Ligand binder design. Structure first.
Ligand SMILES: Nc1ccn([C@@H]2O[C@H](COP(=O)(O)O)[C@@H](O)[C@H]2O)c(=O)n1
Length: 223
């Protein structure tokens, strides 16, 4: 077959970015943070004064999106039109806009080739919502990482508190349920586990346990 792919799909703040990175490093494979692409698209829209409420306006922006990634240094660098926007795209505001633009079918379609371009040997670890169901349906290894909304909001609260940012549980939880609801209820490419995906309920599993479980499954399936 062509290059193998390990997909990691799941709700917001489920630890997909962390797990994807750890696996790609352990296996020495390529990585794809798909969510980062929707976030950069949303950011580009604000900069270029594109109406996020209009699918017609967003299609051109998506079709000609100039986004690139750089890593293998300890963290992922997201580049928009030649500028590092790694930090700028990690906010609730951008996340919200990314989820809104992601609901448009024509926009998602315009981004398919770009994502699928990431499949290269020796392999690709793809993190997102519809990686195992729409972007890479023939993936030999599909993982669906999940955890309760309450736990996922709690983990985010602690991450922001470490950095000294103002937050309160009620908002973070509401924000998370709001975004996940949209992603799971949209008519096209909704967040849903692939029939053949291994579901990892990590509410009470540590980071290292998840990594160990995900790697065992992939190695058995791939070899
Ligand atoms: N494969 C993907 C990755 C992200 N997304 C969208 O992008 C938003 C932001 O994703 P991340 O939180 O994973 O960065 C999600 O809420 C979702 O609406 C998607 O629809 N399909």
């Amino acid at each position: 077959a062509i290059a193998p792919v390990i997909t990691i799909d799941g709700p917001s703040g489920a630890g997909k970015g962390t797990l994807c990175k750890a696996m790609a490093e352990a296996l020495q494979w390529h990585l794809l943070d798909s969510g980062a692409i929707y976030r950069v698209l949303a950011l580009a829209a604000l900069h270029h004064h594109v109406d996020v409420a209009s699918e017609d306006a967003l299609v051109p922006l998506a079709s000609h999106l100039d986004v690139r990634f750089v890593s293998t240094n300890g963290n992922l660098e997201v580049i928009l039109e030649g500028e590092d926007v790694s930090g700028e795209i990690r906010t609730q505001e951008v996340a919200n806009a990314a989820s809104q633009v992601a609901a448009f079918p024509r926009v998602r379609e315009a981004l398919l080739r770009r994502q699928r371009a990431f499949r290269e040997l020796p392999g690709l670890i793809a993190d997102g919502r519809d990686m195992g169901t729409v972007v890479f349906p023939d993936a030999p290894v599909k993982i669906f990482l999940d955890a309760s909304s309450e736990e996922r909001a709690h983990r985010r609260m602690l991450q922001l508190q470490e950095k000294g940012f103002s937050v309160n549980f009620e908002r973070l939880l509401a924000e998370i349920k709001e975004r996940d609801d949209r992603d799971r209820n949209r008519a096209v490419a909704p967040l849903v586990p692939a029939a053949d995906a291994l579901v990892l309920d990590s509410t009470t599993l540590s980071i290292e346990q998840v990594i160990e479980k995900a790697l065992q499954y992939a190695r058995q399936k791939l070899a």
